[PDB]
Structures are given as C-alpha cells and as structure tokens.
Write an enzyme that holds these catalytic residues in place. Structure first.
Site, PDB file in Angstrom:
ATOM      1  N   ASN A   1       0.774  -1.133  -0.102  1.00  0.00           N
ATOM      2  CA  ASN A   1       0.074  -0.024  -0.106  1.00  0.00           C
ATOM      3  C   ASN A   1       0.845   1.304   0.012  1.00  0.00           C
ATOM      4  O   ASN A   1       1.985   1.319   0.641  1.00  0.00           O
ATOM      5  CB  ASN A   1      -1.015   0.070   1.127  1.00  0.00           C
ATOM      6  CG  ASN A   1      -2.295   0.796   0.942  1.00  0.00           C
ATOM      7  OD1 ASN A   1      -2.304   1.642  -0.177  1.00  0.00           O
ATOM      8  ND2 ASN A   1      -2.800   0.998   2.230  1.00  0.00           N
ATOM      9  N   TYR A  16      -7.849  13.356  -1.926  1.00  0.00           N
ATOM     10  CA  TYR A  16      -7.936  12.414  -0.859  1.00  0.00           C
ATOM     11  C   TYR A  16      -7.623  13.298   0.338  1.00  0.00           C
ATOM     12  O   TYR A  16      -6.761  14.192   0.441  1.00  0.00           O
ATOM     13  CB  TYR A  16      -6.788  11.577  -0.917  1.00  0.00           C
ATOM     14  CG  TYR A  16      -6.577  10.736   0.170  1.00  0.00           C
ATOM     15  CD1 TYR A  16      -7.463   9.835   0.543  1.00  0.00           C
ATOM     16  CD2 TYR A  16      -5.392  10.831   0.930  1.00  0.00           C
ATOM     17  CE1 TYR A  16      -7.329   9.251   1.997  1.00  0.00           C
ATOM     18  CE2 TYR A  16      -5.075  10.004   2.133  1.00  0.00           C
ATOM     19  CZ  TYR A  16      -6.123   9.321   2.434  1.00  0.00           C
ATOM     20  OH  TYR A  16      -5.768   8.386   3.532  1.00  0.00           O
ATOM     21  N   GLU A  35     -12.137  10.272   6.481  1.00  0.00           N
ATOM     22  CA  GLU A  35     -11.427  10.218   5.335  1.00  0.00           C
ATOM     23  C   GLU A  35     -12.347  10.274   3.806  1.00  0.00           C
ATOM     24  O   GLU A  35     -13.144   9.509   3.829  1.00  0.00           O
ATOM     25  CB  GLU A  35     -10.956   8.611   5.422  1.00  0.00           C
ATOM     26  CG  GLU A  35      -9.611   8.628   4.247  1.00  0.00           C
ATOM     27  CD  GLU A  35      -9.146   7.128   4.476  1.00  0.00           C
ATOM     28  OE1 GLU A  35      -9.659   6.234   5.164  1.00  0.00           O
ATOM     29  OE2 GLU A  35      -7.846   7.283   4.259  1.00  0.00           O
ATOM     30  N   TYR A  74     -12.466  10.626  -0.377  1.00  0.00           N
ATOM     31  CA  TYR A  74     -12.225  10.341  -1.623  1.00  0.00           C
ATOM     32  C   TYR A  74     -12.896  10.970  -2.692  1.00  0.00           C
ATOM     33  O   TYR A  74     -14.237  10.892  -2.722  1.00  0.00           O
ATOM     34  CB  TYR A  74     -12.073   8.720  -2.007  1.00  0.00           C
ATOM     35  CG  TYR A  74     -11.314   8.050  -1.124  1.00  0.00           C
ATOM     36  CD1 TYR A  74     -11.566   7.842   0.445  1.00  0.00           C
ATOM     37  CD2 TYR A  74      -9.862   7.554  -1.546  1.00  0.00           C
ATOM     38  CE1 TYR A  74     -10.495   7.037   1.163  1.00  0.00           C
ATOM     39  CE2 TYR A  74      -8.940   6.817  -0.774  1.00  0.00           C
ATOM     40  CZ  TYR A  74      -9.280   6.484   0.425  1.00  0.00           C
ATOM     41  OH  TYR A  74      -8.746   5.897   1.654  1.00  0.00           O
ATOM     42  N   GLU A 132      -2.654   6.203  -5.416  1.00  0.00           N
ATOM     43  CA  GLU A 132      -2.586   5.432  -4.296  1.00  0.00           C
ATOM     44  C   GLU A 132      -2.653   3.949  -4.902  1.00  0.00           C
ATOM     45  O   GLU A 132      -3.491   3.809  -5.886  1.00  0.00           O
ATOM     46  CB  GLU A 132      -3.827   5.421  -3.555  1.00  0.00           C
ATOM     47  CG  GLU A 132      -3.993   4.386  -2.513  1.00  0.00           C
ATOM     48  CD  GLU A 132      -5.156   4.561  -1.396  1.00  0.00           C
ATOM     49  OE1 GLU A 132      -5.837   5.462  -1.457  1.00  0.00           O
ATOM     50  OE2 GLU A 132      -5.501   3.440  -0.854  1.00  0.00           O
TER      51      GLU A 132
END
Lengths: 185, 185, 185
Positions: free
Chosen positions: B43, B75, B84, B86, B174
């Site tokens: 990741n 992000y 969080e 996106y 990402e």
C-alpha cells in the site's frame, strides 16, 4: 388509449405505460380526469398530471378498485440525481415497502417513509442505478390533498435529496399481475 | 523521496506514505507537480496539495498508468467528525466501491457516491473507527477540474457530514498490490 | 415512590417506570434531585427533568453505581416524527449500541452516534414502529454538562431528524436485569 405514450389532454399532462401484459386501457376525460381498466396485467403505470414536477398541492378525487396488486400514488422523477419517487395513498393486496427510514405527517395522514435502490434498472434516463423514495400512507384512502413539498422536506431531513424536476409528476394508477379499475380527477 | 514523510515543495504541501511493500518512489517537481513509480507495492499514498483541506476548485493534469490496483483521487481528512474522503477520477483493475448512497454531478462528470465504515483502523488521529466518503467517477479520466465543494454539498445532502479541515487534502496516487507510474501537476 | 407515575417535585418534572421486575425505588429529593435503588430488576426508567423537551444545557451531578446493566443518560421523546432519544454519559456491564452513524463532540467528550429501529414496540404514542437516536460517550462519566442541541444538530447532519418536543426529557437512570443505585441532581 391502449399504447405507451405521453401528451396533454384537457390542459393536463398525461402518461400511459404498460409492459404488454394482459389488457390495460386508459380513459382520457375532462380536465385533469382519467380512469383505467385492466385484466391480468403484467405492469402498467397511468395517470394525469404535469410535464414537470414541482412543489405543489395535488388535489385528487375518485374511485380506486384493485383486484390484486395496484397502487394509487403520486409518482414522479427528478434528475441530478436521478430518482423515482412515490407518495402512495392507497394500495391493493400488497403494501409498498423498502428500507425503513421513518415517517412524515401531512394532509391529515401519517406516511411511513422507505428507501430502495434499483440497480441497472429501467428509468427516464435509460438503464440506470438509482434510488426510489417512498411515502406510504399508514391508512388507505381515495381522495384529498397531497402536499408534495411536505414529503420532499421530510425526505430531505432523512438524507433523501431530490434532483431537478426535469420529468413528469402524475397522480398515478399502477398495477402488477392483477386486475381492476380506477377513476380519478 | 522513498520514505514516509510530509512537507512543502515548490510552495505546495506534499505527503508520501507506503507500508514498505515492494518499491515506491515519488518525484517532487516544479510547482504543484509530482510523479510516482512503483513495483509490486503493498500500500502507498502519494501526492501534492494542501496542508489544510478547504472548499476549493482543484485543477490537475498529467498521466496515470496503473498495472493492477491504483486510484487517482482527491484525498483528505477532517476532524470532528473524523472522516477520510475520496473523490476518484480514475482507477486501475479495481473500482472503489462501498455502501451505495447515490450520485453527484460535477465538472462534466457523474460520480457514484458511497459510504464505508472503518472499525479500529489507522487514521490521522490514530487507531480509530470512522466513515469514508466516496465519489467515484462513472467514467475514468486523467485531467480537469474537481470542484470539491460540489462533492461536499452532495455528501451533506446524503447525511454525510464533514468535519473540520484540520488535515491535508492532496491530489493523490494510491496503489495496492500492484505496479505502475503516474505524473500529475 | 414505587409505582409507575409522572408529576412535578420541587419544581421539576419527574417520571418513574418499571416493568414490575425485582425491586425498584425512587427518592424524590430537593430541587432537581433524585436517586434510585434496585435489586434484580427487569426494566425500569427513572429520573427528573422537564415535562417538555427543548434545546437546553442540562447540568447534572451525583453518583451512579450499577451492578449489571444500567445506563446514565439524558432521555426523551419527540412527536412528528415519533422518536426516542438517548444521550448516555455512563453505563454498567453493557454498552448501548446500534447501527453506527458516526460521532459528535460536545462538553469535552466524544460520543459515538447510533441509530436503531423499534418495530411495533411500546412508546409514548402506544404500540409503534420508530427510530431511536443514540449518542454514547466514548468514555464513562458521572457529572457535567450535556448540551442537548449539539447532539440534536449532529444527529440532523446524519439524517436523523427530531420531531416536536411534545414529551418529557429527563436525566435518567435506567436498568435491565440487574441491581444497583444512583443519586443525581
């Protein structure tokens, strides 16, 4: 009429749709008035209303006589987002339901509100995924006022936003695998 | 750079993070510009943006070339509540998804919005339980405007409130268990 | 007192309820003050507060000593829609939970917010289906301020609308299949 179509009659928008199943007819009468008759239908939606939805007070009267599954409901669509809405005053052998959100009180009645998601389903914008907003009267009736905006506002409070009223709003008769008739003004 | 870190480059906030997996590098270039390269990563998250989130119109360009799972996405995080977010313009072999809420239309595109809940997961505030808000473009692209506030407002309408912009907002690359590269300004 | 009832004491609304289980008593003391004692109860709710809910800052102090399941919580109902709300500062061997919505921060604490639906359950309006809104403090405490409106607003942001404050709001002790005592002002 007996074939899928849209138009104006007596100054009122109207829409007729069936999936071909059984026999379904719609009478276009004076002013805002219409009726329907059907025998062992598959699916149909019919009613009179407006080319474009809006915050309005929808007054209606008549008779609703289902033998099997049918709804008596204000019915419309929005764009951005795409959403199909119902406010059901009456129904047949099946009560429309979905994911329970809560309730709204309007026009002397209390409606349960539900939400469901249609995935890759037919819509005014084609095969689409979209949400259906429901208000289903806790008690059946035929006739009165449906103050659309009270439903709109309550739905908004429950995280159910409506889009642009780019499509119709009709006071509709809808049936599924059943027979019956309705007459509404 | 190749090691987890935060800072400013060419007047722009930047952040780099990887879980050590495979090989991942980030190029810090002129102005808002960066790039990434990676091979069989675990990741990683990398991009350039702002130390603090905000209602802004985020303009970006470049190339995005994933071989496996990777996202091209605005992000960020908020506090109070911790969330969080996106807004994904492009992706690789996997499309980011979650609990379907609906859609939002902005910057010539239509994004599906989803919500997911991370339970006792890593965050900017440590091991926490929190919600992730998503907007995933229905069609892939690399480049254009992302008007952040249109997403924020739509999410709010769907009961997805944002907190305080106490943390970053980056235009991020990402990846997860894959290889590839990106170059974005 | 020892029998289900409602009234005013020292200028303060009060309410006592038990399902008959075990032994439960409530002390009505000076001003806003009360206490409870109970042994192997079934269900009970007791506290002092207001005949009508409202946006207010609820200040409270005392002791809370559960042996088994009990909550220390602001507790009320609204109408239109009908909803039972909790804001729980303390609890016993069981932590109140439900469908996770998120969090709200108020009065130096952070509460998880949850929603649950009771179907054909007892209420202030009789056997009903309705939503319960929860705020459960992430850390237990006895004493301080509970700024009700901060919870109300956050719940609203999460699509959890409150109705009319047609019913009480009490700072309540509630227990289920357990023993203990409390003393709160």
């Amino acid at each position: 009429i007996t074939t899928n179509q849209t138009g104006t009659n007596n100054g009122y928008y109207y829409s007729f749709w069936t999936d071909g199943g059984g026999s379904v007819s719609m009478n276009l009468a004076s002013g805002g008035s219409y009726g329907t008759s059907w025998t062992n239908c598959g699916n149909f939606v019919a009613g009179k209303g407006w080319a474009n939805g809006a915050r309005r007070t929808v007054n209606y009267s008549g008779s609703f006589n289902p033998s099997g599954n049918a709804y008596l409901t204000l019915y419309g669509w929005t764009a951005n987002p795409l959403v199909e809405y119902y406010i059901v005053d009456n129904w047949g052998t099946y009560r429309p339901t979905g994911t329970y959100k809560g309730t709204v009180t309007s026009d002397g009645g209390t409606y349960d509100v539900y939400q469901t998601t249609r995935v890759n389903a037919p819509s005014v914008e084609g095969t689409k995924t979209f949400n259906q907003y429901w208000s289903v009267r806790q008690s059946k009736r035929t006739g009165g006022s449906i103050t659309a905006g009270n439903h709109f506002d309550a739905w908004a409070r429950y995280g159910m936003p409506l889009g642009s009223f780019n499509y119709y709003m009709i006071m509709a008769t809808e049936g599924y695998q059943s027979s019956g008739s309705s007459s509404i003004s």
